[PDB]
Amino acid sequence: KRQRFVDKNGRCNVQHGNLRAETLMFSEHAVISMRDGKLTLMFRVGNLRNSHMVSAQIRCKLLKSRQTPEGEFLPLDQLELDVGFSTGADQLFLVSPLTICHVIDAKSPFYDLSQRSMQTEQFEVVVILEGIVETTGMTCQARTSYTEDEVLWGHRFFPVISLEEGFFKVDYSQFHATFEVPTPPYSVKEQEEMLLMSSP
Amino acid sequence: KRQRFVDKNGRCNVQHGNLRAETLMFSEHAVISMRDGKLTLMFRVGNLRNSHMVSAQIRCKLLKSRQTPEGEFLPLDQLELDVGFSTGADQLFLVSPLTICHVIDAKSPFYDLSQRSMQTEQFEVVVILEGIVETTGMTCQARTSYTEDEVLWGHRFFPVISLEEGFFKVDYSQFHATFEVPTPPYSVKEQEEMLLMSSP
Amino acid sequence: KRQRFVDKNGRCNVQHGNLRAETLMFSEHAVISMRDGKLTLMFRVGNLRNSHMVSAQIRCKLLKSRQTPEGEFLPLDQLELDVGFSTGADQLFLVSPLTICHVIDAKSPFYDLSQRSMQTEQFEVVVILEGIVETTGMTCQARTSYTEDEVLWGHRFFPVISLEEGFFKVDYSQFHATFEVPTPPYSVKEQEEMLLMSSP
Amino acid sequence: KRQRFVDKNGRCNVQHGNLRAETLMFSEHAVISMRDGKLTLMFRVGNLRNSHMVSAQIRCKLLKSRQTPEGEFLPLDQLELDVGFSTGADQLFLVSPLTICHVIDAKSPFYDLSQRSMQTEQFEVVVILEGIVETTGMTCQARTSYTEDEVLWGHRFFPVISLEEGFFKVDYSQFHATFEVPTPPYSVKEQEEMLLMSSP
């Protein structure tokens, strides 16, 4: 009886309301905060075509100038940010907006990014979203970028989907909106360090 | 001498008989039951184009409202259901119907889904099947959905393929049909718990 | 000075001589024999378009009727045969013929296939080769099949490529040809068993 | 305030200056040298279309004649060179030139390639770069090759990107340029051997 998101035949019961306007779109900011027990870098992606995006896939690169231990200066090195290639979660079912998650762990290049170290670091998260417009079979690409000052430590995205009368409504007025939530200041590596300290 | 499924040249010796009618199709229900020693979520997919589906690939998302440990309400979170991305089994050779299998294990979001817990949970399995119609090079997508009341604990699919005179016949009258088979009521996690109990 | 296979600009110095004739092609048989220390199932694939095959990828399914431990009869179950999806070796650079290799190990469904057990088993290896004809952007698929009597235990493929005067020549008269080589009769599982026996 | 590589809308602020000329291009040579603590095989790839390359992906094969332990002569065997398929780093964001890296480790076929052993070995690195020209949806492939004498032990690529006034400039006069840097002569396997020697 309760309303389903997708009908047996494939039709999605989503409505798009309160309308990067009218294509694929990305939240203005990214955030870092606690989810399911882990420090997570998050941003939001949306689809306002009314074609389905077939084989939708997202990837993320961290762009940064750095110096290698050997002393070489790399003016704009690209490091991978895992956003699903490890589970298949990077192959998106994107009809309503999703919060893409990068879990910060020992393999993440943000492993030792703390709230304080962020005020000093310079980096750029580059997001790449590719898919096939079912309408024409054409492959398209959209991108965005987050600089260090567009990543908000201790913020959480508001929800944009609600249940109302036989469809799931998406409130695009809340697409970019975040709020502050209590969040440790430490990097995951520091958090890790401070446990292999205070452990019996 | 015995009849082969595929001839040396590539031609499949399948016949489609007793005919989601005339496209790609999905069983009406999914089931959960024991196969090869493991509790498995199963559903059936078919192909009634007479184009071959080139690069056919299936994925599955569990859609559910939940609350994170941090107390955030996620109105429609998407979790991955592994249906092969770990072995390449998600790249289907789909001429006759297949029973797609999700092995329920510690990584599955259904790890603690028991027959009793199912009467209370609300979830939606979303299935996405993509391929290229060889005929035109166009990429298509078909989908379906299983709600908690369309997943049948302790059911098994009937077989739809038989051998008859120089071809393998597919009986589409049995495509959706299941039957009850004796199956433990417990979740895999409970099954696991009850062994690290009663073990010398 | 010595002749290279591929020039700096991308042009391949292969010549095709002594000519599944004039498309993609597959050896008539597969073999099983020792390579680099492991029992390997091998077959040969060729490309006689004169388009390059872009994003060429091969997969292999074992088709077999079997009975599950729970006593269910599966009339035509599909098991994966790893032919590279673990290293990226399944994304082929296919200008001259290649010997595709399935290493028989504990994960292979042929793990306990011995020369004697082969005289009794019924199975069908199905091979699927997909790529994009660069010429038109169209995605094509070719297939073949090996039954149990078309898999030759203790055979080895002859080489089809030689060096001659500024190009690498492919001798298509030897494409299907194999010869017998001395090869243990035992399955890999038996080989494994017989070492955890005779071990100090 | 500081200039970003990619604008919020996706537009890249790269300029291409001092101009394999006018397509996709590859450095003339590859090098092997120390980066981030590891012996790395490196080469450079560029994109001078002014279409974006959508779903850009690179792979690398080592082509070599060798003899298997069983005594078979393989006139032109293909071994995989990992250039990212393990992290997703093989799916390139290629607007300015990148230095593609193959980390030499125990799985690399170059695991025991030393500077001295290189003067004797014969091999060919084959590079394959595929993508979709966004302009037309057509899939293209470019290739190059490095023979043993085109791989420079103890060389490092110069940087080709600099910051200048509201855009990142690419100096194509330095695209092929390398210089010598101090680098151990030993293979990684020898380096490894010489540590499990001189270890308390």
UniProtKB/Swiss-Prot annotation, chains A, B, C, D:
Associates with KCNJ5/GIRK4 or KCNJ6/GIRK2 or KCNJ9/GIRK3 to form a functional G-protein activated heteromultimer pore-forming unit. It is found in: Membrane. It comes from the Eukaryota. Residues 20-39 are annotated as: Polyphosphoinositide (PIP2)-binding. Belongs to the inward rectifier-type potassium channel (TC 1.A.2.1) family. KCNJ3 subfamily. The chain holds residues 42 to 370 of 501 of the full protein. It comes from Mus musculus. Inward rectifier potassium channels are characterized by a greater tendency to allow potassium to flow into the cell rather than out of it. Their voltage dependence is regulated by the concentration of extracellular potassium; as external potassium is raised, the voltage range of the channel opening shifts to more positive voltages. The inward rectification is mainly due to the blockage of outward current by internal magnesium. This potassium channel is controlled by G proteins. This receptor plays a crucial role in regulating the heartbeat. This is G protein-activated inward rectifier potassium channel 1.
